[PDB]
Amino acid sequence: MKYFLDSAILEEIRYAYENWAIDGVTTNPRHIMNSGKPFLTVLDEFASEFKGVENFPISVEINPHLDNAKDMVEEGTKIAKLSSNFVIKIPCTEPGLIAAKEFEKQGISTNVTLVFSPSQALQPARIGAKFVSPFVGWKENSGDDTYIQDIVNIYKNYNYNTEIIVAALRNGKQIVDAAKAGAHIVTCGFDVYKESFQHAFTDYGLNKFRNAWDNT
Amino acid sequence: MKYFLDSAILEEIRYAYENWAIDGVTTNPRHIMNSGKPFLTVLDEFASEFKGVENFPISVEINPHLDNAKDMVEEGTKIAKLSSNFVIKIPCTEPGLIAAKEFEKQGISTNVTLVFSPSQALQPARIGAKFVSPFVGWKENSGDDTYIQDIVNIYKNYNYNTEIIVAALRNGKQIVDAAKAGAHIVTCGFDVYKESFQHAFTDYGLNKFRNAWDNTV
Amino acid sequence: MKYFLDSAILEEIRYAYENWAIDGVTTNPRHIMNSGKPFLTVLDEFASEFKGVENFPISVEINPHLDNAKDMVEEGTKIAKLSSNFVIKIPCTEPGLIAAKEFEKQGISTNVTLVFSPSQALQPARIGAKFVSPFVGWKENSGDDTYIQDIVNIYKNYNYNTEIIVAALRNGKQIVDAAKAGAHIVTCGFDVYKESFQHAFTDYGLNKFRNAWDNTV
Amino acid sequence: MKYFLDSAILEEIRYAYENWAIDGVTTNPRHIMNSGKPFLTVLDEFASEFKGVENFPISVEINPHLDNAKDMVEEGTKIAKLSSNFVIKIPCTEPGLIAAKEFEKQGISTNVTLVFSPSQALQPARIGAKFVSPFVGWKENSGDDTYIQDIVNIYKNYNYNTEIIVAALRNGKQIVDAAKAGAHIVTCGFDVYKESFQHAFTDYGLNKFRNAWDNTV
Amino acid sequence: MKYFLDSAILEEIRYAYENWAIDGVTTNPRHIMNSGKPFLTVLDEFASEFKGVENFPISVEINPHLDNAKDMVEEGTKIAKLSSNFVIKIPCTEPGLIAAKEFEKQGISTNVTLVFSPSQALQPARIGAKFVSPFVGWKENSGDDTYIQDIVNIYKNYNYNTEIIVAALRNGKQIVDAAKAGAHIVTCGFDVYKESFQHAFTDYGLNKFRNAWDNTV
Amino acid sequence: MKYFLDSAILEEIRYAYENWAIDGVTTNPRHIMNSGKPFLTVLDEFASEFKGVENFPISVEINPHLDNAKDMVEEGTKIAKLSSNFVIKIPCTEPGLIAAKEFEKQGISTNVTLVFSPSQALQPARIGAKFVSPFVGWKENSGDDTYIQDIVNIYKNYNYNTEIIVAALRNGKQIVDAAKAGAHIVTCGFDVYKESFQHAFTDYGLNKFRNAWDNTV
Amino acid sequence: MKYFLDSAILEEIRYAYENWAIDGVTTNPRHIMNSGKPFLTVLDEFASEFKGVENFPISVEINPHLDNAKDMVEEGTKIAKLSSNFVIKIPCTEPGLIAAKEFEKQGISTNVTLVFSPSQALQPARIGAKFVSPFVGWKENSGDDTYIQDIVNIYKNYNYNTEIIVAALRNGKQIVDAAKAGAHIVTCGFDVYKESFQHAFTDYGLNKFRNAWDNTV
Amino acid sequence: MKYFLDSAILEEIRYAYENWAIDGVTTNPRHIMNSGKPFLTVLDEFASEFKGVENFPISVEINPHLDNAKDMVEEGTKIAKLSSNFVIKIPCTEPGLIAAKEFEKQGISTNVTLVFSPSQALQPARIGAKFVSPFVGWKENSGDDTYIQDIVNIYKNYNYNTEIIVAALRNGKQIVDAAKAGAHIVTCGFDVYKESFQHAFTDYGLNKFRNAWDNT
Numbered sequence A, H: 001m002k003y004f005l006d007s008a009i010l011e012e013i014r015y016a017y018e019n020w021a022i023d024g025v026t027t028n029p030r031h032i033m034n035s036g037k038p039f040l041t042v043l044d045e046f047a048s049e050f051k052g053v054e055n056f057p058i059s060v061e062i063n064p065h066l067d068n069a070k071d072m073v074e075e076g077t078k079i080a081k082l083s084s085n086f087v088i089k090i091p092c093t094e095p096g097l098i099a100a101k102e103f104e105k106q107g108i109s110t111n112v113t114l115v116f117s118p119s120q121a122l123q124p125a126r127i128g129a130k131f132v133s134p135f136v137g138w139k140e141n142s143g144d145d146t147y148i149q150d151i152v153n154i155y156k157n158y159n160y161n162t163e164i165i166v167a168a169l170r171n172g173k174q175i176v177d178a179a180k181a182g183a184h185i186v187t188c189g190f191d192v193y194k195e196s197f198q199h200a201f202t203d204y205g206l207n208k209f210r211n212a213w214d215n216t
Numbered sequence B, C, D, E, F, G: 001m002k003y004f005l006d007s008a009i010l011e012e013i014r015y016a017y018e019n020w021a022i023d024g025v026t027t028n029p030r031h032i033m034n035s036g037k038p039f040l041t042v043l044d045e046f047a048s049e050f051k052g053v054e055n056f057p058i059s060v061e062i063n064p065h066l067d068n069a070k071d072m073v074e075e076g077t078k079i080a081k082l083s084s085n086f087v088i089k090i091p092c093t094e095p096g097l098i099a100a101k102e103f104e105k106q107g108i109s110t111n112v113t114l115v116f117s118p119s120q121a122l123q124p125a126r127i128g129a130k131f132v133s134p135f136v137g138w139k140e141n142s143g144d145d146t147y148i149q150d151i152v153n154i155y156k157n158y159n160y161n162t163e164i165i166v167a168a169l170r171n172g173k174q175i176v177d178a179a180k181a182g183a184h185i186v187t188c189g190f191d192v193y194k195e196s197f198q199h200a201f202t203d204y205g206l207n208k209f210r211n212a213w214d215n216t217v
């Protein structure tokens, strides 16, 4: 099970890598906006921070305004030529799935993102996408139950190599649901991961044990 | 199905009451801290705005440092005397369940809060608490699945009048889980309720119908 | 179980009303564009074809562009001064649910449409909407399974009077899915209803029974 | 639970009525062909045999070649006047469901037959058919499986008075499937009913009990 | 739940009636053979033992060689005159179901026995049999799983008054399956009932409680 | 839902009765060996403590060495004459069930205890025992899963008035299992009830709410 | 299936080894406040008793007041240098999981204890902890159902080598629940293991077999 | 699937071995009492009857009045030294499980009997007992449902070579419940096996075939 930090801040990407053993980092245009730094700056820092680090995927979304599968394959190329750890993140559109097939044919790893159905997720796997990111949190905010088990089961039944990155996770019970399903990776913010490692009954027992130690 | 606004901001309680038909405002020491106003001030403004309004439960938690059921029955009696809409919120502890049984015997409505198991929910029901608030969000943040259906089923099987207020709700899917269980009330923040009323397919269809209207005479 | 004809063509509305006993009619801006007639005319013709009839709800949607609950209240009030049978169809949005609550308070029947979750469907129920239309076909076209049973169960558990109109139905196993759930009404196009009444095994048996009748005096 | 004899032979109808307490008789153009007597003759005999008998429905299918409603309502209005026990059996076709609605409006009991889906069985109920005959054996000869629980559940959920007659039954285990579903009536041939009343373990026990009786005084 | 003693021994019938509150007694040609007394004597000691006792049914099987519904309604009528507590037990044969319908029409209570399927049992209920005895033990001895829940559910769904007597019971686990199904009566031998009232964890606790009582003033 | 205190200590019975609203008290021959006081001294303190209190059943087990239903019926009559609030507790054995039937016929309330099977629980209710105590903890200690739902269902199904007292409970999750089943009463020690009312997540929230209160003016 | 003795009393550790074949020993700061001997003494005894007994893990918890992962790694390195059988037990806290990752990198076996959620048992195995101890008893005492199957199923899927030690077990039914889930090890007190090996039906059969042996030559 | 004859009568053991292919024989102090012969006599006959027969286990229970693991590993050793087909049957008690662990260490096959829970069955497995006999008919005679499925499934999640000889079986329906679970052996008396091979619909068909054979 891989834990990808869904953040674009280096302080938290350095902490999680040295203390939590994160296996990768996913970013979206909103995480880079919240960074406060320009996009190219965030990329330069991420490229140097993990220059040598191998097997550390860094998903980076291309211009969200791109509408042609050809202006995507030419922008996500400039980007993929900035760091070998960079994985071009492309939305679940028709120009995106056409651009993700061309990218994968040229050997550029792609993460087909914004997938909200098991039918929007099968095509990315039939064009050899390295990663497919099915979103959970967004659908739930609108009162929809979150198809993740279906994608895991389909991927397995047809021996697909595409790795599923359950995204928009907001709590550790959703990490346990992704993991109960068999999802390959789970991407979550720094705080979702910290709270997932904590429990009130650990603090209760700690107080009971801290007492028995002080009475010995 | 009651929708209670979990907030201590009046401008939001004003809107939600005039547009969403909120059935009551729950609050906790953290919501009053985030209000930026002193506790007694928040109470006065809520005791005035909803002065005549009948059947608008306003749950207000007493001092969380109170450790004796006697110090509780005395602090919550004072708060309850400030408006008839106010429902004293007491934590599910020994000194809270003893204090909730007294208040309920004196006719002061009580909301036994911080309940995280169906065993902690049954005692509040056996002492005639008006409300019992089982929390969901907190347990989930620690990787625990959220016992709500058990409480609803137990309450129903034993004909208890205590109304269940599923609390710590963070999304509309958790509001749909509480409704599918049969919970009486669901307390959520203003933004959880707004997003629960919205869907992407409702913007998709409204673009398809907005274009059809433009190609019509 | 009510069968509403999802059509704006009076020629198919007239056939279904006499031969299939349809219980009502629903029209979206796209059906009134496919009619080929202007809207205010498709209206005049329904306002006259059913002037005598009552309990035959005719759902009709307002400018899919209106963004304010006030401008939505003014437009749907006028469209309702056209015929007692006219039920104003409003999208499940922020200003649509605010406009549907004001409409229902003035006694104008409303059909909160474009609902794609049980959470967007509970608020329409809370404000006393006459009808709530949960869409099925659109979600399926995008690979999503179609929450209809949840809405039926929630509506029933909380004794809501709002009648559920399963919409975007494309076949008769989807009409059988809505009936198995307990949905009140199902809205479908004329051809979905005709094919739902037919089966190949009925034509097989008919041929076997035709052969027997012939080999008999 | 009603047991209708699916036969046009009056030696089997007379036996089953006096010994098995059959509650009715269903016939199809193939049962009348196998009778060896002309259709009108079989009808005259059935009309006299049960002249006074009340509550004994005798389902009789009209010409299977009839393709128009107007021509169906005319051949069964004339088959109905030959006995008050006769129930016009009409195929689940467009012209058949239109003819079954006109018939039911004139007070002529109708049995909409050849129904092989729950979507085809709902319309007969939405037009007040006295009986709807969902078919089992035919669909299973072709490998398919038997919806005969969906129809029962739908009929019940919507309080329909139409009585379901599970037809094409070939064994008592299918009589037990229809009874477990809640079907109102089951129509079966004389031999299906006889074998359904018999078991090998009844003959085994009978031999064990016949042995003891002989080793007693 | 009623408990009928499946025995023809009056020392066991007398004990079970005074200590276990048995509600009736069922006998078969094999129980009378094992009695060691003549059938007539066993039938004249049961008549006197319960002369006045009301609501104490005593099921008595007629000659198992009877093959005609007539010679069996003549021999059975005879036994039914020798006491008002006697219920004629008739096998689930064709001549038996015809004879059980005639008897039930003359007001003689009948117990249609040797029923090994829910179809062999729906007919006894459609003719108004007072009791239907579905056998369990015999089918199990041959490796067949024991349809009892189906009969209970069918009887209930169609509001039948026939009372189900689960027979051939051999252990208390089978008495709890009949009860978990909703069977009206369970017939068992004296030893099956005694052991069903005992456990080894009741003897364990008794020893723990006897040790405590001793170590106490 | 009744909470009986499984204790013979009057400091815990008096606290539970005044703060937790216990509805009754159950005692076993070993909880008395533990009280330190002699048996009839324990009883006489219970009789005075609850002389006025009506409807507070106090289950008291008779001599566990009693082997005859006559000796048991002679000794439980004496104990029952020492208070109306006393309910004679009898083991589920042959002579205990015979003694419990005689006791119930004389109007002395009985609690048939040491029941470990759903089959041992049936004769108890088939003789009108006031209470039946199915034990859970003992069976679990030996690796056996704990039949309680079966007893609740069998009791409901055959509409029996005997009240089920789930006994040997050791944790609040077993109290939530009994409540989810529909058991009438649950008997537990003082500490099982205290811990059942407490949760670590209530102490967590209390600390979060105590920090917020301190930053509020 | 490994059975670790949750004890710090060497009379019980020595017995369980020589007679029950325990596969290891787990201890906590409260088991050592109960062993009387000071901590370092208990450790010296455990180190000598198992000086050359390979594959006998002895889990020993470090100072529970340690709040820094650096202070925990210094204290647990010292304890681990006292024996090769010793396994440093660290709480599932932020600094505990950081200290357990450093320990496992230096080759010191660690047992991440106090895990109550399956999201907490995931960082532990995503850092190569030798053991993860999910607690059951504590959660149950507060009325919470005990996620153990989820952890087992998550470890198998992702193929984590970390061995799960279900802790706080209190009966043999909870040992049978852990075994049915597929847990690697179960840690229990000496008395939980003794009672788990005993059953009242083994004493019943033993008495039946002892009576037979006596009535035999 | 092994069918052991739960009998101490050699006329029934001889018949079942030659006609039903029984794979073994289990006996208890009550079966030897009902034999009418002295215990040592029954043993001598069983030892000679199957002197050469290999892979024919004969479970023989020792004094039920023994409470010391030392007098039980001393009374078994003597019996086990009478025939190599003999398997010492020991009750699931503290001293029985201690005595079964000593026997199994000395290479004497043991059948830990009187097991009525899956917890009481796991210890016999953890000490290498050849056989474990979970009883069914005694628990059901008192109204308890019969765990035999979780003894089979735990003995499989943990690869235990102990073989489950499910005992106290009284009808063919339990010989089929045990088979549907995955029990290795099932012990039943001569007649629970005879009746299990017979059905009324085999006599019904035989009369149809028999009649259709006088019409041909």
Ligand SMILES: *[C@H](CO)[C@H](O)[C@H](O)[C@@H](O)CS(=O)(=O)O
Residues within 6 Å of the ligand: A006, A026, A027, A028, A030, A031, A059, A089, A111, A113, A114, A133, A137, A165, A167, A168, A169, A187
């Ligand atoms: C990339 C998917 O692989 C992104 O990081 C994703 O947008 C979301 O995970 C997060 S959020 O909604 O923006 O929080």
Ligand SMILES: *[C@H](CO)[C@H](O)[C@H](O)[C@@H](O)CS(=O)(=O)O
Residues within 6 Å of the ligand: B006, B026, B027, B028, B030, B031, B059, B089, B111, B113, B114, B133, B137, B165, B167, B168, B169, B187
């Ligand atoms: C009262 C319960 O009835 C409170 O408003 C409650 O604390 C929580 O609902 C919310 S949060 O965790 O503080 O968001």
Ligand SMILES: *[C@H](CO)[C@H](O)[C@H](O)[C@@H](O)CS(=O)(=O)O
Residues within 6 Å of the ligand: C006, C026, C027, C028, C030, C031, C059, C089, C111, C113, C114, C133, C137, C165, C167, C168, C169, C187
């Ligand atoms: C109104 C809902 O009550 C409409 O008629 C609805 O849009 C859809 O039912 C149909 S479609 O997708 O336009 O076919």
Ligand SMILES: *[C@H](CO)[C@H](O)[C@H](O)[C@@H](O)CS(=O)(=O)O
Residues within 6 Å of the ligand: D006, D026, D027, D028, D030, D031, D059, D089, D111, D113, D114, D133, D137, D165, D167, D168, D169, D187
């Ligand atoms: C009428 C239905 O109510 C008929 O009798 C029906 O065709 C079938 O039941 C029988 S068969 O296939 O012709 O045997």
Ligand SMILES: *[C@H](CO)[C@H](O)[C@H](O)[C@@H](O)CS(=O)(=O)O
Residues within 6 Å of the ligand: E006, E026, E027, E028, E030, E031, E059, E089, E111, E113, E114, E133, E137, E165, E167, E168, E169, E187
């Ligand atoms: C009557 C049925 O009501 C009989 O008593 C029945 O045969 C069987 O219950 C018993 S047995 O197989 O003969 O034991």
Ligand SMILES: *[C@H](CO)[C@H](O)[C@H](O)[C@@H](O)CS(=O)(=O)O
Residues within 6 Å of the ligand: F006, F026, F027, F028, F030, F031, F059, F089, F111, F113, F114, F133, F137, F165, F167, F168, F169, F187
């Ligand atoms: C009476 C049953 O109603 C007793 O109080 C019972 O023995 C047990 O509940 C408790 S324990 O095992 O002795 O703890």
Ligand SMILES: *[C@H](CO)[C@H](O)[C@H](O)[C@@H](O)CS(=O)(=O)O
Residues within 6 Å of the ligand: G006, G026, G027, G028, G030, G031, G059, G089, G111, G113, G114, G133, G137, G165, G167, G168, G169, G187
């Ligand atoms: C270590 C976990 O591996 C301990 O021994 C644990 O605390 C608990 O198992 C037991 S108790 O609650 O202290 O009884």
